[PDB]
Design an enzyme around this catalytic site. Structure first.
Site, PDB file in Angstrom:
ATOM      1  N   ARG A 138      11.999 -21.264  32.413  1.00 18.15           N
ATOM      2  CA  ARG A 138      11.982 -21.200  30.951  1.00 18.15           C
ATOM      3  C   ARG A 138      13.014 -20.206  30.453  1.00 18.15           C
ATOM      4  O   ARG A 138      13.327 -19.252  31.150  1.00 18.15           O
ATOM      5  CB  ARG A 138      10.589 -20.758  30.478  1.00 18.15           C
ATOM      6  CG  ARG A 138      10.207 -21.144  29.064  1.00 18.15           C
ATOM      7  CD  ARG A 138       8.734 -20.842  28.822  1.00 18.15           C
ATOM      8  NE  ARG A 138       8.475 -19.422  28.965  1.00 18.15           N
ATOM      9  CZ  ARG A 138       7.282 -18.842  28.937  1.00 18.15           C
ATOM     10  NH1 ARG A 138       6.163 -19.541  28.747  1.00 18.15           N
ATOM     11  NH2 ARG A 138       7.218 -17.528  29.092  1.00 18.15           N
ATOM     12  N   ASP A 139      13.529 -20.412  29.241  1.00 21.70           N
ATOM     13  CA  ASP A 139      14.387 -19.407  28.613  1.00 21.70           C
ATOM     14  C   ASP A 139      15.542 -19.091  29.574  1.00 21.70           C
ATOM     15  O   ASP A 139      15.721 -17.957  30.013  1.00 21.70           O
ATOM     16  CB  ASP A 139      13.556 -18.146  28.300  1.00 21.70           C
ATOM     17  CG  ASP A 139      14.237 -17.206  27.301  1.00 21.70           C
ATOM     18  OD1 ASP A 139      15.118 -17.669  26.540  1.00 21.70           O
ATOM     19  OD2 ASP A 139      13.889 -16.000  27.265  1.00 21.70           O
TER      20      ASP A 139
ATOM     21  N   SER B  66      11.444 -13.814  27.766  1.00 17.00           N
ATOM     22  CA  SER B  66      10.381 -14.790  28.010  1.00 17.00           C
ATOM     23  C   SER B  66      10.846 -15.506  29.268  1.00 17.00           C
ATOM     24  O   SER B  66      11.921 -16.083  29.264  1.00 17.00           O
ATOM     25  CB  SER B  66      10.263 -15.780  26.845  1.00 17.00           C
ATOM     26  OG  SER B  66       9.901 -15.131  25.637  1.00 17.00           O
TER      27      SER B  66
ATOM     28  N   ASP C  94      13.740 -23.426  22.356  1.00 13.26           N
ATOM     29  CA  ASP C  94      14.962 -22.979  23.037  1.00 13.26           C
ATOM     30  C   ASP C  94      15.503 -23.921  24.115  1.00 13.26           C
ATOM     31  O   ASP C  94      16.690 -23.851  24.431  1.00 13.26           O
ATOM     32  CB  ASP C  94      14.804 -21.567  23.612  1.00 13.26           C
ATOM     33  CG  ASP C  94      14.231 -20.573  22.593  1.00 13.26           C
ATOM     34  OD1 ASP C  94      14.227 -20.876  21.375  1.00 13.26           O
ATOM     35  OD2 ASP C  94      13.781 -19.490  23.019  1.00 13.26           O
TER      36      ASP C  94
ATOM     37  N   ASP D  27       8.896 -10.201  20.881  1.00  9.53           N
ATOM     38  CA  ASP D  27       9.864 -11.149  21.437  1.00  9.53           C
ATOM     39  C   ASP D  27      10.330 -10.742  22.845  1.00  9.53           C
ATOM     40  O   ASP D  27      10.903 -11.550  23.564  1.00  9.53           O
ATOM     41  CB  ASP D  27      11.110 -11.238  20.543  1.00  9.53           C
ATOM     42  CG  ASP D  27      10.807 -11.744  19.142  1.00  9.53           C
ATOM     43  OD1 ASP D  27      10.080 -12.759  19.005  1.00  9.53           O
ATOM     44  OD2 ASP D  27      11.321 -11.138  18.165  1.00  9.53           O
TER      45      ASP D  27
HETATM   46  O1  LIG Z   1      16.186 -18.188  18.049  1.00  8.24           O
HETATM   47  C1  LIG Z   1      15.428 -17.484  19.041  1.00  8.24           C
HETATM   48  C2  LIG Z   1      16.030 -17.722  20.424  1.00  8.24           C
HETATM   49  O2  LIG Z   1      17.413 -17.363  20.379  1.00  8.24           O
HETATM   50  C3  LIG Z   1      18.096 -17.104  21.629  1.00  8.24           C
HETATM   51  O3  LIG Z   1      19.495 -16.801  21.559  1.00  8.24           O
HETATM   52  C4  LIG Z   1      20.360 -17.699  20.867  1.00  8.24           C
HETATM   53  C5  LIG Z   1      20.616 -17.208  19.448  1.00  8.24           C
HETATM   54  O4  LIG Z   1      19.406 -17.321  18.696  1.00  8.24           O
HETATM   55  C6  LIG Z   1      21.744 -18.003  18.785  1.00  8.24           C
HETATM   56  O5  LIG Z   1      22.008 -17.439  17.494  1.00  8.24           O
HETATM   57  C7  LIG Z   1      23.026 -18.015  19.635  1.00  8.24           C
HETATM   58  O6  LIG Z   1      24.006 -18.919  19.046  1.00  8.24           O
HETATM   59  C8  LIG Z   1      25.369 -18.830  19.519  1.00  8.24           C
HETATM   60  C9  LIG Z   1      25.818 -20.214  20.022  1.00  8.24           C
HETATM   61  O7  LIG Z   1      25.209 -20.438  21.304  1.00  8.24           O
HETATM   62  C10 LIG Z   1      27.347 -20.381  20.147  1.00  8.24           C
HETATM   63  O8  LIG Z   1      27.686 -21.765  20.347  1.00  8.24           O
HETATM   64  C11 LIG Z   1      28.072 -19.832  18.909  1.00  8.24           C
HETATM   65  O9  LIG Z   1      29.505 -19.980  19.004  1.00  8.24           O
HETATM   66  O10 LIG Z   1      27.710 -18.448  18.733  1.00  8.24           O
HETATM   67  C12 LIG Z   1      26.314 -18.261  18.430  1.00  8.24           C
HETATM   68  C13 LIG Z   1      26.118 -16.761  18.211  1.00  8.24           C
HETATM   69  O11 LIG Z   1      25.445 -16.580  16.962  1.00  8.24           O
HETATM   70  O12 LIG Z   1      22.709 -18.407  20.978  1.00  8.24           O
HETATM   71  C14 LIG Z   1      21.654 -17.720  21.661  1.00  8.24           C
HETATM   72  C15 LIG Z   1      21.363 -18.389  23.005  1.00  8.24           C
HETATM   73  O13 LIG Z   1      22.493 -18.278  23.859  1.00  8.24           O
HETATM   74  C16 LIG Z   1      17.326 -16.632  22.884  1.00  8.24           C
HETATM   75  O14 LIG Z   1      17.940 -17.044  24.108  1.00  8.24           O
HETATM   76  C17 LIG Z   1      15.883 -17.103  22.878  1.00  8.24           C
HETATM   77  O15 LIG Z   1      15.152 -16.338  23.850  1.00  8.24           O
HETATM   78  C18 LIG Z   1      15.258 -16.956  21.491  1.00  8.24           C
HETATM   79  O16 LIG Z   1      13.921 -17.466  21.536  1.00  8.24           O
HETATM   80  O1  LIG Z   2       0.661 -14.745  27.040  1.00  7.80           O
HETATM   81  C1  LIG Z   2       0.972 -13.743  26.057  1.00  7.80           C
HETATM   82  C2  LIG Z   2       1.010 -14.295  24.621  1.00  7.80           C
HETATM   83  O2  LIG Z   2       2.040 -15.285  24.456  1.00  7.80           O
HETATM   84  C3  LIG Z   2       2.266 -15.659  23.084  1.00  7.80           C
HETATM   85  O3  LIG Z   2       3.366 -16.575  22.992  1.00  7.80           O
HETATM   86  C4  LIG Z   2       4.623 -15.908  22.909  1.00  7.80           C
HETATM   87  C5  LIG Z   2       5.369 -16.052  24.228  1.00  7.80           C
HETATM   88  O4  LIG Z   2       4.637 -15.389  25.255  1.00  7.80           O
HETATM   89  C6  LIG Z   2       6.755 -15.442  24.093  1.00  7.80           C
HETATM   90  O5  LIG Z   2       7.498 -15.642  25.301  1.00  7.80           O
HETATM   91  C7  LIG Z   2       7.483 -16.082  22.912  1.00  7.80           C
HETATM   92  O6  LIG Z   2       8.826 -15.569  22.815  1.00  7.80           O
HETATM   93  O7  LIG Z   2       6.728 -15.808  21.733  1.00  7.80           O
HETATM   94  C8  LIG Z   2       5.450 -16.447  21.748  1.00  7.80           C
HETATM   95  C9  LIG Z   2       4.748 -16.227  20.411  1.00  7.80           C
HETATM   96  O8  LIG Z   2       4.602 -14.825  20.173  1.00  7.80           O
HETATM   97  C10 LIG Z   2       0.993 -16.273  22.487  1.00  7.80           C
HETATM   98  O9  LIG Z   2       1.189 -16.559  21.094  1.00  7.80           O
HETATM   99  C11 LIG Z   2      -0.184 -15.317  22.697  1.00  7.80           C
HETATM  100  O10 LIG Z   2      -1.396 -15.926  22.220  1.00  7.80           O
HETATM  101  C12 LIG Z   2      -0.300 -14.925  24.180  1.00  7.80           C
HETATM  102  O11 LIG Z   2      -1.406 -14.040  24.422  1.00  7.80           O
END
Ligand SMILES: OC[C@H]1O[C@@H](O[C@H]2[C@H](O)[C@@H](O)[C@H](O[C@H]3[C@H](O)[C@@H](O)[C@H](O)O[C@@H]3CO)O[C@@H]2CO)[C@H](O)[C@@H](O)[C@@H]1O
Ligand SMILES: OC[C@H]1O[C@@H](O[C@H]2[C@H](O)[C@@H](O)[C@H](O)O[C@@H]2CO)[C@H](O)[C@@H](O)[C@@H]1O
Ligand code: BGC
Length: 362
Positions: A90-91, A97, A137, A315
């Site tokens: 994942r991720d 995450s 993601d 996060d």
């Molecule tokens: O939105 C939450 C998730 O975001 C993650 O990272 C991404 C950024 O949110 C996103 O803004 C960025 O975008 C890049 C794009 O990939 C590129 O093509 C462009 O030229 O530039 C942008 C920069 O603003 O990308 C990243 C991912 O690589 C996290 O990875 C994730 O955990 C999170 O949930």
């Molecule tokens: O298991 C812990 C917790 O996870 C929560 O989901 C998260 C996830 O773990 C995280 O990787 C992601 O970036 O955000 C989500 C939402 O906050 C979930 O909501 C909880 O109930 C749980 O206990």
């Protein structure tokens, strides 16, 4: 079989018991009675229930059981909002995450089991509507992060997993919105065409079912639905909010053979212009609760504004020694110290309350 129109119409949104319990405990640590009462108003605002670990799948049964009993007692049709979030590896572009499942240790088969377990609880309670967000993601990373070795190695698995979840959930009458990044990820003009291609292909391979309703955007992010005043962090991108992003993606998706609808996370969008770089996503300092969940949206393409990411749940950790430490979580505009992703981040929640736009009334 699928009903016509907006799937949120005429339904009461079930309120997350997990988030309610968390807010209750957050409120109990706040002494100011005007801030305390404001904090407690948040457990009244619908959020999505995340199934990020397979140990939570049976809690879906408990929630659906509860929502069915509410429905029988009130006569009011209920809708339960959930997130499917447990793909193996994942991720893939980050570490905050990180996921319980690995492709090297039977990951795909374990993910299938995870989906079947969600499906088997949903079978038990057919009288309640479910809306599901599929794998935040995942696919977004397939458009823009194929350069990252872990994402390349995960691509087949991500596509297979999301397709499996869609077909299994669509068989059970669940309305799905596949996660589709955000304005600052896929709205960049170079990523718009390949995004439309990919999501249209997923729709096709999952069987073009009408329960596959569309996409979700801005999940766990902070973008405006609509901004008049531009954010200078968006320099180089000509779709600088979620409505422009959707208004540029939707026609392309249509052309790729999918008339997609949309939902938009606004849960931490209350305050704009709080980031130095647009790619900064981790516990961004000074964020506030945003536009409230509503079916009164600015476009026919947008079914609903929602709160997908539940504000106050972290996060990512800022502890540099932790296995899951991502360097984005130690940024200058990140709220520190931060606990592990998913866990309660009290001081962050308090600022979300303080910075709510619209303000929370006591
Ligand atoms: O939105 C939450 C998730 O975001 C993650 O990272 C991404 C950024 O949110 C996103 O803004 C960025 O975008 C890049 C794009 O990939 C590129 O093509 C462009 O030229 O530039 C942008 C920069 O603003 O990308 C990243 C991912 O690589 C996290 O990875 C994730 O955990 C999170 O949930
Ligand atoms: O298991 C812990 C917790 O996870 C929560 O989901 C998260 C996830 O773990 C995280 O990787 C992601 O970036 O955000 C989500 C939402 O906050 C979930 O909501 C909880 O109930 C749980 O206990
Ligand atoms: O604006 C940057 C902010 O980063 C946060 O981690 C700190 O808690 C603030 O005190 C600091 O000013």
């Amino acid at each position: 079989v699928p009903s016509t129109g907006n799937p949120f119409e005429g339904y009461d949104i079930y309120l997350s018991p997990y988030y309610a319990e968390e807010v209750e405990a957050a409120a109990a640590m706040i002494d100011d009675p005007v801030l305390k009462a404001k904090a407690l108003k948040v457990k009244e605002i619908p959020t999505f229930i995340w199934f990020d670990v397979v140990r939570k799948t049976p809690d879906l049964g408990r929630y659906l059981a509860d929502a069915t009993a509410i429905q029988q007692r009130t006569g009011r049709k209920q809708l339960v909002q959930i997130v499917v979030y447990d793909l193996p590896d994942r991720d893939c572009a980050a570490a905050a995450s990180n996921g319980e499942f690995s492709l090297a240790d039977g990951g795909m088969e374990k993910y299938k089991d995870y989906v079947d377990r969600l499906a088997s609880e949903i079978r038990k309670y057919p009288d309640v509507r479910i809306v599901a967000v599929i794998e935040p993601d995942s696919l977004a990373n397939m458009v823009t992060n194929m350069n990252v070795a872990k994402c390349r190695g995960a691509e087949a698995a991500y596509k297979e997993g999301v397709i499996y979840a869609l077909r299994q959930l669509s068989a059970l009458g669940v309305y799905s919105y596949v996660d589709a990044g955000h304005a600052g990820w896929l709205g960049w003009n170079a990523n718009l065409a390949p995004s439309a291609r990919l999501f249209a292909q997923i729709y096709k391979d999952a069987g073009r079912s009408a329960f596959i309703r569309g996409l979700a955007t801005n999940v766990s992010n902070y973008n405006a639905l609509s901004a008049t005043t531009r954010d200078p962090v968006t320099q180089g991108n000509d779709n600088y909010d979620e409505l422009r992003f959707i208004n540029a993606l939707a026609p392309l998706l249509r052309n790729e053979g999918w008339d997609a609808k949309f939902i938009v996370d606004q849960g931490r969008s209350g305050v704009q212009n709080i980031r130095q770089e647009w790619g900064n996503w981790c516990n961004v300092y000074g964020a506030g609760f945003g536009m409230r969940p509503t079916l009164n949206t600015p476009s026919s393409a947008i079914d609903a504004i929602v709160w997908i990411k539940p504000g106050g749940e972290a996060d990512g950790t800022s502890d540099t020694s932790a296995p899951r430490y991502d360097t984005h979580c130690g940024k200058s505009d990140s709220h520190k110290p931060a606990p592990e992703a998913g866990t309660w981040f009290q001081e962050y929640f308090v600022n979300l309350v303080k910075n709510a736009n619209p303000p929370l009334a006591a």
